[PDB]
Amino acid sequence: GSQIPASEQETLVRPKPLLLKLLKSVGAQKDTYTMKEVLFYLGQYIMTKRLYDEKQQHIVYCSNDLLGDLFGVPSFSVKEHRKIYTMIYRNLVVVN
Ligand SMILES: COC[C@@H](C)c1nc2cc(-c3noc(=O)[nH]3)nc(-c3cncc(Cl)c3)c2n1[C@H](C)[C@H]1CC[C@H](C)CC1
Known part of the structure; x- marks a missing residue:
């Protein structure tokens, strides 16, 4: 929650195909996203x-x-911040 650094929002990611399908239904398609964008x-x-x-x-x-x-998962709490980052991370590739 409060032990997640702000710098995490700047991480650059390429979504795997199913996360990308999901993102395409709400935002502009592109190759690379920020974590801020993936979360929004x-x-x-x-x-x-x-x-x-x-x-x-x-x-x-x-x-x-x-x-x-x-x-x-069938459900999760928006309060489970570390859990959410992990489930997101498994659906993307970090780029640097
Ligand atoms: C249903 O989401 C609506 C959205 C506006 C949202 N409402 C949040 C409430 C709390 C909260 N946290 O503690 C409390 O009591 N409410 N937290 C977040 C949060 C924000 N940034 C990083 C994370 Cl992992 C969590 C919230 N979000 C972020 C944008 C959404 C959470 C779900 C994941 C899959 C995408 C991102």
Whole structure:
């Protein structure tokens, strides 16, 4: 949560095909993204599709959704910051 450095938002990534499919439904297509962008587009995907129950323990429900196949989970909490970064990282390649 608070032990995640700000520098993490600047990491450059090439999404794997399924994460890219998902990103293409909410943002401009491109080869390389920042982590800031991947987080904003994933957030926008979830909110637009009404996958997130805010006043219900802050859980994203994704078992009826491609997001679920991407993450390998039926649901998760937006408070599980390290978990989320990990599930995202497994769906992309870091570039440098
Ligand atoms: C449903 O998402 C809507 C979006 C606007 C959002 N609402 C958050 C609430 C909290 C929060 N955290 O603690 C609390 O109590 N609420 N945190 C985040 C957060 C922000 N940056 C890094 C991470 Cl891993 C988490 C939130 N997001 C970020 C943009 C979204 C979270 C889900 C992942 C897959 C994409 C990114």
